[PDB]
Structures are given as structure tokens and as C-alpha cells.
Write a protein that binds this ligand. Structure first.
Ligand SMILES: Cc1cc([C@H](C(=O)N2C[C@H](O)C[C@H]2C2=NO[C@](C)(c3ccc(-c4scnc4C)cc3)N2)C(C)C)on1
Lengths: 104, 145, 91
């Protein structure tokens, strides 16, 4: 089972997939290959929860049922600039307009 | 061009609706006229009694959106090996994003008000051009030419 | 693999597999003619461009597969902007 993810930090969102059986650390290797930052400089989150490097994605609650291509599950990412990391900040997307009269 | 062959060879089929739509099976008769058959609720199946060389296609019963059967447009019952019925798997296609948007907008806006949406004229016509089996049959006919 | 950066009108940066992004012929043209792997969309806000990237993933996964295909979900509040975006992107 592939799971489909959005790795999000500030205004950056990475679309990627991984095996449910792969670990958080292996996912950290994917983002460093993309965003050029080592795992020990990365923190991955599910909601407000820090994930252990050794845990599988499925153990962290990323399953095919909840991480679908058309509806990926969100991973928070925070970087260690020099020390104490930073607090997780995932910027939300823009707001849709009010439904036009003819659709409401 | 597109018509069922009068093979007179019975062929048993399972119409399996692996879609979330209510499915309308449509038989192309010996003259090429589309014949609608009873609908299938989402996820249900029917063992239909058919014939070799007959032509079937499948649609959303409410909107006439196109559907796939065994990964293609048309289903032709084949020979039943050891009496085993032929499986017909009806699925959603991968719609284009544009067509998928047209479906959702069509489902939310009465046709009188398409013109009241703030969109380019060409999209009005795109919205207004509701799926219809006969135009698809005409297109498919040229596809052969 | 290779990735590209897709930037919405409000400045959100979406990084997608190059192969996924090349689903859109419009984007294919933005990469080969008129930062080498970035495209800015002055007209597509982040709540639309995010759904488009989800569409690319969905299309690549389920095209030519024998797995039962799920509906691509579109919230009514974004259907109108997604329609114009999809039309522009030819996908
Ligand atoms: C000989 C010969 C006979 C024929 C022709 C004929 O008999 N046909 C045409 C197609 O091959 C289907 C078959 C047929 N028509 O009615 C049944 C009994 C039928 C009833 C319901 C459902 C469905 S589909 C969804 N729900 C149900 C229950 C499916 C099939 N079988 C014509 C006489 C119409 O062509 N050659």
C-alpha cells in the first residue's frame, strides 16, 4: 500500500508518496533530497504530534484509507536553523469566495 | 456502423457496478439504436442474460456521464468458458479535470442560470453540452473511419 | 526523481513530481519556453492550485489501472475557480 502525502511548512507544500511500511526517517530522506536539509534538522508532525524516526507511516496513522491520491494526508515539517528548531507553522491556503447566488 | 451482431449465441454476463453512480446499461440494437435497460444502484450487480457479439455501453443514469466497462468504452459479451459468466466491471473513467468540474457545476446550477455565471462564453457552451449517447456514438463511429 | 515548483497567486509553493506536472500541456509549455523549474500563476490561488496538484496525483495513479476508480471530490465553493483553472491548464 502506497500512501499519498502533503509535507507542509510555512508556504511550501510537497506532494509525494511512500509505502505504508516505510518509516518516518525514510520520509525524512525524501524531503532532504528535495528541500536539501538533513533529518536531524527536520521534524515531522501528524497534527500537533512529533513522530519517531523508527516508526512506520502506518503506525503513525498514514494508511491508504486516509492518504489517498485525490485527498492526501498532511505532514507538518519544521526546520532546525542552528538550535532549538522552530515551532511548527503550516500556512493555510486561501479562502474560497462566497457561493454565488445560483449555487447556494 | 456500431450495431449488435445477431449471433444467437447466449452469453451470461455479470454487470458489476464498481462506481458511485447509478448506472444505466445501454444496448446498441441490430439497427444501431441505443436501447436503455434497467438501472444499477451504486455498487450493485446483476446477472444479465445476453448474447455473443452484442454491444453494450454504460452511463450515469441521471446525467448520462460516460462510464468505462472493463477499462474501455464498449462491452462485447464473449464465450463463457466452462459455463463461467463474463464479468463486466463498470467503473468511473479518469475524467479530465475540466469535465469533472463541469459535472459538479451542472449538478449545482439549474440550466437556466448557466448564463448567469461569470465565466467565458465558451464555458457556457461547454456546460450546455450535456452528455448524450448519440453524439458519443457518432464520435466513436468516426474513430473507426 | 525531478520535481517542479508551482507557485500560486498568493505565493504558496507546491513541489510536485515533474512527470505529474507534465500532465498539463500548458505547464509543459511554461517549462520549455516562456527558476528553471518554477512556474508562477498570477491567476490561480492556493486553494485551487492545491486541488490541481491533487488531481495530477489522482490522474497518474488511476489512469490505466484495474483497481476500482474513486470519484475525484470537488467542494462546491471551489468548483467555479477549478473549472477556469482546469480549462486554462488543459487537464
Ligand atoms: C436472440 C436475441 C434476443 C435479443 C435481444 C435480447 O434479448 N437482449 C438484448 C441484449 O443482448 C440483452 C438481451 C436481453 N434483453 O432482455 C433480457 C432478458 C434482459 C433483461 C434485463 C436486463 C437487466 S440490465 C440491468 N438490470 C437488468 C435486470 C438485462 C437483460 N436480456 C432482444 C430480443 C431485445 O437479441 N438476440
Amino acid at each position: 500500500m502506497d500512501v499519498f502525502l502533503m509535507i507542509r511548512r510555512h508556504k511550501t507544500t510537497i506532494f509525494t508518496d511512500a509505502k505504508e511500511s516505510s518509516t518516518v526517517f525514510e520520509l525524512k530522506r525524501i524531503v532532504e533530497g528535495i528541500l536539501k536539509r538533513p533529518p536531524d534538522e527536520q521534524r515531522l508532525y501528524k497534527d500537533d504530534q512529533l513522530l519517531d524516526d523508527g516508526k512506520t507511516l502506518g503506525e503513525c496513522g498514514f494508511t491508504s484509507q486516509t492518504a489517498r491520491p485525490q485527498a492526501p494526508a498532511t505532514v507538518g515539517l519544521a526546520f532546525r536553523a542552528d538550535d532549538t528548531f522552530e515551532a511548527l507553522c503550516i500556512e493555510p491556503f486561501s479562502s474560497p469566495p462566497e457561493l454565488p447566488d445560483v449555487m447556494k | 456502423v456500431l450495431r449488435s451482431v445477431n449471433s444467437r449465441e447466449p452469453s451470461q454476463v455479470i454487470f458489476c457496478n464498481r462506481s458511485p453512480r447509478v448506472v444505466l446499461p445501454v444496448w446498441l440494437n441490430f439497427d444501431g439504436e441505443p436501447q436503455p435497460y434497467p438501472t444499477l444502484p451504486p455498487g450493485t450487480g446483476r446477472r444479465i442474460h445476453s448474447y455473443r457479439g452484442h454491444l453494450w455501453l454504460f452511463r450515469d443514469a441521471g446525467t448520462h456521464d460516460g462510464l468505462l466497462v472493463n477499462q474501455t468504452e464498449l462491452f462485447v459479451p464473449s464465450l463463457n468458458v466452462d459455463g463461467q459468466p463474463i464479468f463486466a466491471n463498470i467503473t468511473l473513467p479518469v475524467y479530465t479535470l475540466k469535465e469533472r468540474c463541469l459535472q459538479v457545476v451542472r449538478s449545482l446550477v439549474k440550466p437556466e442560470n448557466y448564463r448567469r455565471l461569470d465565466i467565458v462564453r465558451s464555458l457556457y457552451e461547454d456546460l450546455e453540452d450535456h452528455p448524450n449517447v448519440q453524439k458519443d456514438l457518432e464520435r466513436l463511429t468516426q474513430e473507426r473511419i | 526523481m525531478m520535481y517542479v515548483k508551482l507557485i500560486s497567486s498568493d505565493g504558496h509553493e507546491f513541489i510536485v513530481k515533474r512527470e505529474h506536472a507534465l500532465t498539463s500541456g500548458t505547464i509543459k509549455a511554461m517549462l520549455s519556453g516562456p527558476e528553471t523549474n518554477e512556474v508562477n500563476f498570477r491567476e490561480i490561488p492556493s486553494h485551487v492550485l492545491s486541488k490541481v496538484c491533487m488531481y495530477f496525483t489522482y490522474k497518474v495513479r488511476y489512469t490505466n489501472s484495474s483497481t476500482e476508480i474513486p470519484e475525484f471530490p470537488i467542494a462546491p465553493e471551489i468548483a467555479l475557480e477549478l473549472l477556469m483553472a482546469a480549462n486554462f491548464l488543459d487537464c
